[PDB]
Design an enzyme around this catalytic site. Structure first.
Site: not given
Ligand SMILES: [Zn+2]
Ligand SMILES: [Zn+2]
Ligand SMILES: [Zn+2]
Lengths: 263, 134, 46, 33, 65
Positions: B3-5
């Site tokens: 989720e973007d990391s």
């Protein structure tokens, strides 16, 4: 002769291109892993500043100084500082260095690893001597000094491995390759139109043999043929990155049998 | 990395990958009352008023300052100012509680009035962490 | 030896008593740095 | 004849010193070029 | 701000090879491509290290103390 065997292809001062066969996929990998970290190396750890003036700060120069490779030959005859009983550092566990530069010249003054001085007595073991890859004999450019830029230091060189910090990294990037002709189906090859017609066939592919379509899927196939290039920092001469690697991979095994017997 | 990391090679950070610096300054003056009553720039210790800070005054010299190059801690004094009232109140300025580092430059001049101006610097080596932004 | 203060420009050692003119004794400039904390600063090589 | 007010000047401007000063004069003025 | 002692991804001593790259083009009139490879820059990790770095240190040396 014995079990898994070696096939040295190319030999040099910083690259051992060879082939490893009969070994388990895991045994090949477990050494590639061991070579990158768990091999003893001497590199500065406690860098003590007396007077600095350089465009780089106290801890700036200090970081780069530990990254300087130093001769790591008889490192298994000088223990880890920690395991000794002295007040922090002594000859048993550490070989201290110094660096005393000043921007004398009207022009720029380049601090090189050659400007380093082995103060703490070496007691008769090849260590603490930087790795000079320079033609000019300079080796490892530290910084630049203009005017009265005086760099008075006190650099302590302790033991250590890359699992602790990569400055003790006995090697650079070890090449690892197996099953070039993918007859083990180890990879779902990506293509818009055709597989090999878009994917380049490896260098190390001139050592295994063509698949031939008039054959089934090698269900009975298992992976050996480990084509490796060992990139040495030069801190440990090529051969020992492999040898003292294999050796320290065994030690961690022998440690388990040892633990099984106290149990 | 979901989720973007994203994951990071520490054995690369170690060499200089996204290694940085951060420098903070500190300001204070030898503030005048008019009747030739000025705040004192030195190392105050209890006596008469005892209205002082709690940090380490012990690191500063006797010009009411640490000379550049010393390793600063957390809440320790960097600026030593004594407030005379009608003795040793105190209006010393310490290191920002959060921060840490080493002293970089200790600058002292005169203002348009000629009041002992101080400019101290706190040199910290900000290194890639487990939750830093990139 | 014995250098309590230092000039930024010309770079000249000074040292003055508590209120003894914040001035370099060559160039008028009120600037100045506080020089080295002689005391040895040990570090990390990471 | 008579002065009236201290007006701040823009960096690298009309009456400003920087503007004219060269790369060397800048590295001397302790100002970044 | 000066040559990184060694590459980030691999760890090969890039440190010294700066004073040897600067001349390799200035003097020998070469292109960056073969000049990087003439030092020993095989994989791109070490290539990007010497190539896309700026020696800001010199611009700081252009000051007084
Ligand atoms: Zn010892
Ligand atoms: Zn002066
Ligand atoms: Zn690399």
């Amino acid at each position: 002769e014995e079990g898994p065997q070696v096939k040295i292809r190319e030999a040099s001062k910083d690259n051992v291109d060879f082939i490893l066969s009969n070994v388990d996929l895991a045994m090949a990998n477990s050494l590639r892993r061991v070579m990158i970290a768990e091999i003893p190396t001497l590199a500065i750890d406690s860098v003590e500043v007396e007077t600095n003036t350089t465009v780089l700060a106290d801890e700036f120069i200090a970081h780069r100084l530990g990254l300087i490779p130093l001769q790591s030959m008889d490192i298994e005859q000088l223990e880890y500082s920690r395991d000794c009983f002295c007040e922090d550092h002594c000859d048993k566990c550490s070989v201290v260095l110094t660096l005393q530069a000043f921007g004398e010249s009207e022009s720029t003054t380049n601090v090189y690893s050659k400007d380093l001085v082995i103060v703490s007595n070496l007691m008769g073991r090849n260590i603490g001597h930087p790795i000079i890859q320079d033609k000019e004999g300079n080796g490892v450019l530290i910084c630049k000094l203009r005017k009265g830029q005086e760099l008075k230091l006190t650099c302590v060189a302790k033991k250590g491995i890359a699992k602790e910090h990569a400055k003790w990294g006995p090697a650079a990037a070890i090449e690892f390759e197996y099953d070039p002709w993918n007859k083990l189906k180890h990879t779902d090859y990506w293509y818009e139109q055709d597989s090999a017609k878009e994917w380049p066939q490896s260098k190390n592919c001139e050592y295994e043999d063509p698949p031939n379509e008039g054959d089934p899927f090698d269900y009975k196939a298992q992976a050996d043929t480990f084509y490796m290039n060992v990139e040495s920092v030069g801190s440990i001469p090529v051969d020992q990155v492999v040898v003292r690697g294999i050796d320290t991979l065994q030690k961690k095994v022998a440690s388990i049998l040892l633990a099984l017997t106290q149990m | 990395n979901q989720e973007d990391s994203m994951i990071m090679n520490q054995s690369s950070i170690d060499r200089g990958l996204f290694r940085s610096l951060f420098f903070r300054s500190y300001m204070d003056q030898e503030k005048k009352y008019g009747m030739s009553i000025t705040e004192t720039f030195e190392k105050p210790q209890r006596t008469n008023t005892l209205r002082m800070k709690h940090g380490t005054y012990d690191k500063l010299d006797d010009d009411g300052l640490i000379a550049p190059g010393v390793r600063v801690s957390g809440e320790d004094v960097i600026i030593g100012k004594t407030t005379p009232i009608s003795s040793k109140r105190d209006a010393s300025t310490p290191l920002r509680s959060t921060e840490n580092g080493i002293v970089d430059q200790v600058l002292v001049t005169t203002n348009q009035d000629g009041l002992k101006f101080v400019k101290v610097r706190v040199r910290t080596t900000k290194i890639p962490q487990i939750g830093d932004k990139f | 030896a014995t250098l309590k203060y230092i000039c930024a420009e010309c770079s000249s050692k000074l040292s003055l008593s508590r209120t003894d003119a914040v001035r370099c004794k060559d160039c008028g400039h009120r600037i100045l740095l506080k020089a080295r904390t002689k005391r040895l600063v040990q570090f990390e090589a990471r | 004849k008579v002065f009236i007010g201290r007006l701040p000047i823009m960096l690298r401007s009309k009456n400003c010193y920087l503007s004219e000063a060269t790369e060397s004069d800048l590295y001397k003025l302790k100002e970044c070029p | 701000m000066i040559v990184p002692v060694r590459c980030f991804s691999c760890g090969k001593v890039v440190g010294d090879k700066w004073e040897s790259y600067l001349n390799l083009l200035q003097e020998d009139e070469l292109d960056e491509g073969t000049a990087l490879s003439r030092l020993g820059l095989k994989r791109y990790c070490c290539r990007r290290m010497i190539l896309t770095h700026v020696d800001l240190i010199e611009k700081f040396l252009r000051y007084n103390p």
